[PDB]
Design a protein around this ligand. Structure first.
Ligand code: ZN
Lengths: 139, 45, 82, 98, 207, 48, 279, 523, 294, 41
């Protein structure tokens, strides 16, 4: 249902997410509500090995991998791929998304576009590139 | 500039030779003469 | 002011990264305002890439005046630059 | 913060971001919405209980206020659009009501 | 204890060196003075016995420039008013154009304006010991500074269409400025050894 | 400034290293003047 | 790009001081002097303690003061352990203790007495063994009690044996190139010692000092190297061309100019001047 | 939602996570001409601060690069043609008529093109009209020992435009100079480097779609010998904390507990003695940490370099570092919060779980458990301390150095003046250029290697015409006469027209190369 | 150990002892002990937004009928003649002997004649009871019995002197060891009591002005007069509390010992369940610390 | 037969001038004492 990128897990350390995907694909199969309280699973027997016993009882691969065929070519991917059941809560920060200004009102005094911002750092960039005419145009 | 005015003198409180010195300085700085601006002072009376 | 003579010119014979852009820009504007194209078109439409076709063959007017810091200036034909 | 499954496996800045970001989910703000005079509410049509959960997610009565669904996530770099932390969303898995 | 005797020795390879470095000429033996060489040259009963004889001179190697130079060590601390003006007519009568002095310590400022006017076509200049005792120019952070004649200064002002006020400046209080004997208006050419690409020549003036 | 849009970006690997994809909405909402000559007259007639 | 570290100030405060305010009195003015051939580690540490400054508090033990007369007795460490970390002699202590210590002690007592308003009667140093120091004082009885413990601690902590003005904490750090890294900046002092070479001396900028007594070009190369080293502690590279241009513009007028009201007040265009800070 | 490619993500410093971008339109034609030629994106391949390039591919493309150029790869005809055409995609770009290929690397018993041949093929299709092929030798990011003992891959060598040996990774194409893409930028001009960067992008994406790449679980788990090695090293260093503390304070390891406790109580009422104690104990713990890392991560963990899908993303340089697989697999090590270590409360116990004046390093913020297995509470608290410390750790100096340096432009007599007319430098910073056009001067081996494309890039027959060649070249040698009275050639002769005049150190270096290692230059 | 003490009272020093004492109605105010370089200790406190500084020996003698041997043998009665404590207490005793008087009645009368102005005490009744009003209302409000305020003051001054000599570590105010939480309803009760006290002071000023004019209506026996005066003044304090809740600007004549006076109320955004809970659990130290970047 | 350094010297010289003219209380030409004037904000 959702393709996530593998390059996001190193330098982020969300190994908790790998364990959670393991536990999801394990719990959904048998029908358990996989217990995931902090600080239960010790160093003797790891949580990964527990959910792996779960999965190999269910039938899937013990490391969580799963043999996938690609859709755009049809023949199998050489390397197995990691599929689990994660819990994705949709965010809401996108409520304030966009404004295109071809022409519109002008200012009372200075005849400027009424209140996008180009200047005092944009001017640095443009006279950095050596673009006199672009500065004198846009400004 | 009022503080430095001399109401009875109608000039500056300064000595007129110092005001003339600074006038010569600001004359000679006009045309771009720096060390020449500073050389005016090598006179002793 | 002085217009430095053609015998002695001290500026760089290279078409600087800036003179190329502005020459092409002003030539594109000129051609956009119904000016004469000095080179056969092959069907290109943009009133700028025609100026690129002109500059590729060095068939362009508009000598440039390079303003030295004295106040003097050189007159370089765009055929003359490298 | 306690309701983050295997919260002792992540680099603790990740648990900090997860707390401060699960406080901002488009989730069910209750059950009496017909009688609310708030300005902006957000509600999630299809929520479920997590399949991986801490027991306190049952004790604290979260079952009455779900936050998200269960996505069948495949860790894979295949589409190519999913770099710089982005991701995809299986189209029919969207048009069936994700 | 008696370390004052090496201080005044080191004030010679900062003065007998402060000649070219200017364009003058000095025998290569007064640059190679050993430690005890100075003692054997200027000795006495002491073991203090250095003063009353610390005075030398030098003539230009350009064979012109009106005229020569004379260095002297005023050992009496805080030279003041009765030790400066009396040591001017000597430079005048030897036809010595410009001279040098020392003082340790605290040259009295009252003895600084009434003598700086008597110089006129001459210039008393300028130094004190315990402040310039080892050549600063012998160093990594100070490039080789060179003076320039008005012909070579005209050449500069011509190749660059400049005015004599558009160049960089060097204040007269700059150590190397009074070291080289700069006058307000002379163009120095400095040989930057900046190692990003080669060693190049910048120019500076005084004002 | 006039003629300056502003939007959220999202990544695409198919286009180019130069190019930027703009939806047809920015196609329709950002315009620039162009004189009409003999050989781009067809483009501009068709555009109007 | 980066500001977080992983003692001298590094990061944007350093750059802010070197290139924005062009301040004298930098927070950590250090110098670095290269040793020579003719010097051994014994002479290295000897010169180190020599140019270093110590405070009479740093050799005194607990100081007891008996009340009545009015009597103060300082305990001084054994000359052996006192000469391991030091090498100031007993006679030096005697002289400077007597003179300057009595001066400081009487000065601070007069300070507190004048504050409360709203002489050194006998002195006995351990003239042979040097492990104690007695000062017997007499006061009028109408004067209120004195916190002699705190006052004597303030005196012994404020009085100095041998200080070169504005230098302290000369230290030795290891390329088989023995060097001395000193806090504070007094070139005028370091001219004097001939154990270490007077040419190859690195300076944390203090570019006021080096501009003042090594030229203008010295200031230029110093500031180039300084900003290079400030950006060198991070894995960010700024080629010497940018630094060369910024430096050689900064030391243009002949000194070294900050990029503030001083430098803003000199431009020839009256619109930028009107623009940037205060119209 | 507007779409832009990944290459620019490094330049704009964007993350595609919600930050939005102003998109202007230059109206007049002069403005769009100058935007197209001067400030267009493909010409922004070099940052101004240093020469090191900033554009270049990212995570997925570079891991798939390590996996495509690897030598155990093989393609049939179908995959070769298809992957190539996905890479090129001529019609959307244009300028080329028909796609041309190579012969196959192996021919019997089945015909198979190899991966390096696909990279060579892309380079062959993007070669300009007449420029001899690329040839180059440069170290790669994936170290040579990871492939084999005395492995050959190591360092990419490729002559006349065919990838002869070595694999491409973050150093080859990306934010790393002197690789493939930067040398294409030098030889074949910028607008070809841009096409090549795009072509590599699509080629690696299409290969991903053929094969795919994923960071599964077993990539992390230590094989039983590995984790028992880790267990043995931790049982060995069970007591390093006490050893280091007792050595610091002066006592022996067998001292009475009460005296050690009294001395410790005397120690960290102060602050400097804490600095010393934490420094010593930190040295001890970091010795232990480096030991178990060095013994475990290269060989302990389950799958070796090529197949381990996190060893690839880590040591190839896509995303992450060696400390990351260290933490996910072996141990976390000391928790250094603002320098020293965990702050001791009033009663001297690091945390209410530990007895007072506790010495064992587990109380000093050294936590042995790894993220894969799970960290315990007392350890998790110190980890929260360090992380939140970071978070509380994570614009006026652009109106100081910019108001005074407004103009500061390089006038035509080649003397960088302020715009009021006054000089600031002659020969701007020892002219050659700010980093953009000065990167490859130090690369004398590369320029002399091919040399047939650089003469056509400089257009010798048009440059040698109108510029002076003999005068400055002659006077240069005389300036290389050590005695003075011959200034630098740049000062006497301007460098724009007198084609012999060049900085002194450049002459010194080119001559020391020509005399020292001319193995390319014949006699 | 806070360095801002130093430049505060220049005879002062950084070492101080702070105590936030609270009445039975959870209406605390502070009163700190400044240890000044001279040796005595000042009893800083707050009243009507204004600092106030009376020497600690003054109120120590004013509190109980005490003789100086008791103060001494209470502060340092131990290990007879411990050097530091013994000389510091001697210096303190004499520095107070400087200007003050002997008995408790004289000290209370001086204290009243000094502080009758700022206390809202009855204008006409008496003068020594105003001293008792201070030593009841400000000095140490959590304690009721005078002798016990005296004992705790001796203990506290002993703690200060121990802290000065380095025999006591500095407790850390920025740590939950020395922190408590103020709930909602207790702050509500404090503000309600403050509004009631303002209401009483307001009808009192209205009665005083009614009497002061010449004598328009003065019948302190007639209930009609009280109906008149109640009808005169603003009798609506519901809107004051409702304003505190609507805005947050705690507008009170005395801050009730609260550093910041803005930002007391958060709007319970029910956007998501966790958001609602996280509103209910959180705490905060106040932006008076946010403005200091450390 | 303007530049920064010229302006950098002019501004300093005029600052010195205005330090000077505000110093004298007695006239040197009139020798008298002109009546002072006191200002407000
Ligand atoms: Zn007058």
């Amino acid at each position: 249902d959702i393709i996530i990128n593998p390059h996001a897990f190193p330098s982020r350390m969300t190994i908790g997410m790998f364990i959670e995907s393991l536990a999801g694909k394990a719990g959904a199969c048998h029908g358990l509500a996989q217990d995931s309280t902090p600080f239960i699973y010790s160093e003797q027997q790891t949580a990964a090995d527990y959910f792996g016993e779960q999965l190999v009882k269910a039938g899937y691969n013990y490391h969580g991998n799963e043999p996938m065929y690609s859709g755009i070519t049809g023949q199998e991917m050489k390397a197995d791929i990691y599929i689990g059941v994660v819990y994705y809560q949709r965010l809401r920060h996108m409520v304030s998304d966009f404004q295109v200004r071809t022409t519109g009102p002008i200012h009372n005094l200075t005849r400027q576009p009424v209140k996008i911002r180009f200047g005092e750092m944009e001017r640095d960039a443009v006279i950095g590139h050596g673009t006199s005419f672009l500065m004198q145009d846009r400004l | 500039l009022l503080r430095s005015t001399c109401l009875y003198c109608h000039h500056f409180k300064l000595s007129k030779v110092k005001v003339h010195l600074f006038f010569c300085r600001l004359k000679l700085l006009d045309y771009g003469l720096l060390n020449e601006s500073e050389m005016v002072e090598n006179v002793s009376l | 002011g002085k217009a430095v003579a053609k015998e002695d010119r001290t500026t760089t014979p290279y078409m600087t990264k800036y003179e190329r852009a502005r020459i092409l820009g002003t030539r594109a504007l000129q051609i956009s305002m119904n000016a004469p194209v000095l080179v056969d078109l092959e069907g290109e439409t943009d009133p700028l890439q025609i100026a690129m076709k002109e500059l590729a063959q060095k068939k362009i007017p508009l000598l440039v005046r390079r303003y030295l810091p004295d106040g003097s200036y050189e007159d370089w034909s765009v055929a003359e630059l490298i | 913060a306690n309701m983050t499954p295997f919260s002792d496996f992540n680099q603790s800045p990740r648990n900090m971001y997860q707390c401060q970001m699960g406080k901002q989910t488009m989730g069910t703000p209750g059950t009496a919405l017909r009688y609310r005079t708030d300005n902006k509410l957000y509600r999630l049509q299809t929520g479920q209980t997590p399949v991986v959960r801490p027991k306190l997610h049952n004790t604290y009565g979260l079952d009455h206020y779900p936050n998200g669904t269960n996505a069948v996530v495949a860790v894979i770099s295949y589409t190519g659009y999913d770099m710089e932390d982005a991701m995809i969303l299986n189209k029919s898995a969207h048009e069936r009501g994700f | 204890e008696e370390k004052n005797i090496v201080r005044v020795f080191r004030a010679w390879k900062t003065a007998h060196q402060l000649v070219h470095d200017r364009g003058y000429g000095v025998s290569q033996a007064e640059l190679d003075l050993t430690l005890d060489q100075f003692k054997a040259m200027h000795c006495g009963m002491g073991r203090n016995l250095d003063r009353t004889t610390l005075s030398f001179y030098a003539k230009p190697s350009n064979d012109s420039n009106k005229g020569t130079i004379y260095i002297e060590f005023a050992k009496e601390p805080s030279v003041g008013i009765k030790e400066m003006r009396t040591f001017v007519h000597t430079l005048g009568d030897h036809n010595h154009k410009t001279g040098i002095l020392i003082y340790a310590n605290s040259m009295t400022p009252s003895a600084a304006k009434i003598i700086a006017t008597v110089t006129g076509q001459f210039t008393i200049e300028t130094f004190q010991e315990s402040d310039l005792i080892v050549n600063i120019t012998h160093h990594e952070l100070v490039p080789k500074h060179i003076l320039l004649s008005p012909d070579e200064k005209k050449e500069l002002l011509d190749r660059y269409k400049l005015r004599e006020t558009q160049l960089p400046r060097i204040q007269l209080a700059d150590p190397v400025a009074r070291y080289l004997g700069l006058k307000r208006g002379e163009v120095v050419k400095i040989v930057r050894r900046s190692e990003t690409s080669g060693r190049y020549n910048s120019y500076r003036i005084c004002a | 400034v006039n003629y300056a849009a502003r939007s959220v970006i999202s990544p695409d690997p198919n286009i180019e290293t130069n190019e930027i994809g703009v939806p047809p909405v920015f196609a329709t909402k950002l315009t620039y003047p162009e004189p009409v000559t003999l050989y781009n007259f067809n483009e501009m007639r068709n555009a109007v | 790009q980066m500001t977080l570290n992983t003692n001298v100030t590094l990061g944007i405060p350093r750059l802010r001081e070197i290139i924005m305010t062009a301040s004298a009195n930098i927070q950590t003015p250090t110098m670095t002097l290269r040793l020579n051939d003719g010097v051994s580690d014994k002479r290295a540490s000897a010169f180190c303690k020599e140019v270093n400054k110590l405070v009479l508090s740093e050799v005194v033990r607990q100081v007891r003061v008996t009340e009545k007369t009015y009597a103060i007795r300082l305990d001084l460490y054994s000359r052996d352990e006192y000469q391991d970390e030091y090498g100031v002699l007993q006679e030096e202590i005697e002289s400077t203790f007597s003179n300057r210590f009595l001066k400081i002690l009487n000065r601070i007592i007069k300070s507190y007495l004048a504050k409360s308003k709203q002489n050194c009667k006998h002195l006995d140093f351990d003239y042979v063994n040097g492990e104690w120091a007695t000062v017997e004082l007499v006061f009028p009885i109408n004067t209120e009690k004195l916190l002699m413990v705190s006052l004597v601690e303030k005196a012994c902590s404020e009085t100095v044996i041998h200080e070169i003005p504005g230098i302290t904490r000369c230290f030795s750090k290891p390329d088989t190139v023995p060097k001395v890294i000193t806090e504070g900046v007094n070139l005028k002092a370091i001219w004097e010692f001939y154990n270490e070479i007077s040419m190859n001396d690195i300076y944390t900028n203090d570019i006021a000092a080096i501009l003042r007594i090594y030229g203008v070009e010295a200031a230029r190369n110093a500031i180039v190297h300084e900003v290079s080293s400030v950006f060198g502690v991070y894995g960010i590279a700024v080629d010497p061309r940018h630094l060369s241009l910024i430096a050689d513009y900064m030391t243009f007028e002949g000194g070294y100019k900050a990029f503030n009201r001083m430098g803003i007040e000199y431009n020839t265009s009256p619109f930028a001047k009107m623009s940037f800070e205060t119209t | 939602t507007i779409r832009m490619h990944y290459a620019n993500c490094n330049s704009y410093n964007a993350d595609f996570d919600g930050d939005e971008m102003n998109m202007h339109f230059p109206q007049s034609t002069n403005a769009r001409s100058e935007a197209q030629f001067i400030a267009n994106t493909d010409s922004q391949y070099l940052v101004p601060t240093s020469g090191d390039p900033l554009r270049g591919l990212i995570q997925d493309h570079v891991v798939m690069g390590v996996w495509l150029t690897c030598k155990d790869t093989f393609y049939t005809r179908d995959e070769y043609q298809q992957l190539l055409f996905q890479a090129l995609k001529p019609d959307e770009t244009g300028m080329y008529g028909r796609i041309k290929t190579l012969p196959p690397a192996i021919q019997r018993p089945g015909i198979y093109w190899t991966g390096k041949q696909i990279i060579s093929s892309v380079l062959l299709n993007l070669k300009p009209s007449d420029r001899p092929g690329l040839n180059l030798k440069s170290k790669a990011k994936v170290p040579g020992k990871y492939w084999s003992p005395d492995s050959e891959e190591g360092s990419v060598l490729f002559d006349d435009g065919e990838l002869l040996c070595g694999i491409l990774d973050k150093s080859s194409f990306g934010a790393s100079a002197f690789g493939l893409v930067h040398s294409v930028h030098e030889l074949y001009g910028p607008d070809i480097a841009g096409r090549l960067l795009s072509v590599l992008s699509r080629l690696f994406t299409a290969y991903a779609q053929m094969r795919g790449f994923t960071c599964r679980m077993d990539d992390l788990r230590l094989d039983e010998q590995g984790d028992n090695w880790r267990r043995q090293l931790l049982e060995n260093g069970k007591s390093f904390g006490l050893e280091a503390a007792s050595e610091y304070v002066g006592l022996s390891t067998d001292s009475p507990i009460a005296l050690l406790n009294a001395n410790l109580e005397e120690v960290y009422r102060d602050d400097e003695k804490l600095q010393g104690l934490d420094a010593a104990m930190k040295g001890k713990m970091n010795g232990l940490t480096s030991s178990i890392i060095n013994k475990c991560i290269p060989d302990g963990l389950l799958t070796k370099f090529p197949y381990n899908h996190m060893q690839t993303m880590t040591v190839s340089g896509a995303k992450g570092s060696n400390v990351n697989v260290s933490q996910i697999s072996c141990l976390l090590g000391q928790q250094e919060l603002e320098g020293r270590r965990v702050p001791l409360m009033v009663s001297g116990k690091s945390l209410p779980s530990f007895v007072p004046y506790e010495t064992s390093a587990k109380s000093g913020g050294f936590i042995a458990s790894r993220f894969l297995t799970g960290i315990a509470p007392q350890e998790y608290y110190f980890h929260c301390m360090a992380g939140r410390e970071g978070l509380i750790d994570t614009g006026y100096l652009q109106r100081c150095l910019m108001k005074h340096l407004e103009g500061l432009c390089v006038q035509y007599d080649h003397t960088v003046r302020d715009s009021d007319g006054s000089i600031v430098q002659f020969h701007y910073g020892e002219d050659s250029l700010d980093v953009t056009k000065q990167k490859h001067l130090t690369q004398f081996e590369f320029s002399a290697k091919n040399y047939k494309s650089l003469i056509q890039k400089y257009k010798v027959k048009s440059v040698l015409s109108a510029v002076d060649s003999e005068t400055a070249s002659s006077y240069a040698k005389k300036a290389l006469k050590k005695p003075y009275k011959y200034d630098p050639v740049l000062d006497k002769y301007p460098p724009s027209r007198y084609l012999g005049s060049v900085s002194e150190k450049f002459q010194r270096a080119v001559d020391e190369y020509t005399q020292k290692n001319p193995d390319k230059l014949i006699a | 150990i806070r360095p801002s003490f130093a430049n505060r009272g220049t005879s002062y020093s950084q070492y101080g002892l702070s105590i936030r004492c609270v009445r039975p109605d959870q209406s605390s105010l502070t009163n700190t002990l400044h240890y000044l370089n001279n040796g005595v200790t000042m009893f800083r406190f707050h009243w009507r937004k204004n600092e106030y500084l009376i020497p600690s020996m003054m109120i120590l003698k004013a509190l109980l009928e005490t003789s100086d041997k008791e103060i001494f043998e209470g502060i340092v009665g131990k290990d007879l003649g411990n050097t530091f404590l013994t000389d510091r207490v001697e210096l303190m005793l004499r520095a107070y002997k400087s200007y003050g008087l002997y008995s408790q009645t004289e000290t209370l009368q001086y204290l009243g004649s000094k502080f009758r102005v700022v206390l809202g005490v009855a204008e006409d009744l008496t003068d020594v009871e105003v001293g008792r009003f201070l030593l009841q209302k400000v000095v140490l409000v959590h304690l009721r019995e005078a002798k016990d305020k005296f004992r705790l003051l001796l203990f506290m001054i002993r703690k200060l002197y121990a802290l000065v000599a380095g025999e006591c570590c500095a407790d850390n105010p920025d740590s939950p060891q020395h922190q408590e939480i103020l709930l909602g309803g207790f702050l509500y009760g404090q503000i309600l009591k403050e509004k009631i006290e303002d209401w009483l002071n307001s009808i009192r000023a209205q009665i005083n002005l009614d009497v002061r004019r010449s004598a328009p209506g003065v019948d302190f026996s007639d209930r009609k007069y009280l109906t008149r005066v109640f009808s005169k003044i603003n009798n609506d304090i519901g809107t004051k509390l409702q304003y505190f809740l609507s805005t947050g600007n705690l507008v009170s004549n005395t801050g009730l010992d609260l550093q910041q006076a803005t930002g007391y109320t958060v709007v319970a955004e029910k956007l998501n369940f966790y958001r609602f809970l996280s509103h209910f659990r959180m705490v905060h130290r106040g932006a008076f610390f946010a403005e200091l970047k450390t | 037969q303007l530049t920064t350094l010229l302006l950098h010297e002019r501004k300093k010289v005029v600052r010195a001038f205005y330090h000077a003219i505000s110093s004298r209380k007695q006239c040197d030409n009139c020798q008298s004492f002109s009546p002072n004037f006191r200002k407000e904000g």
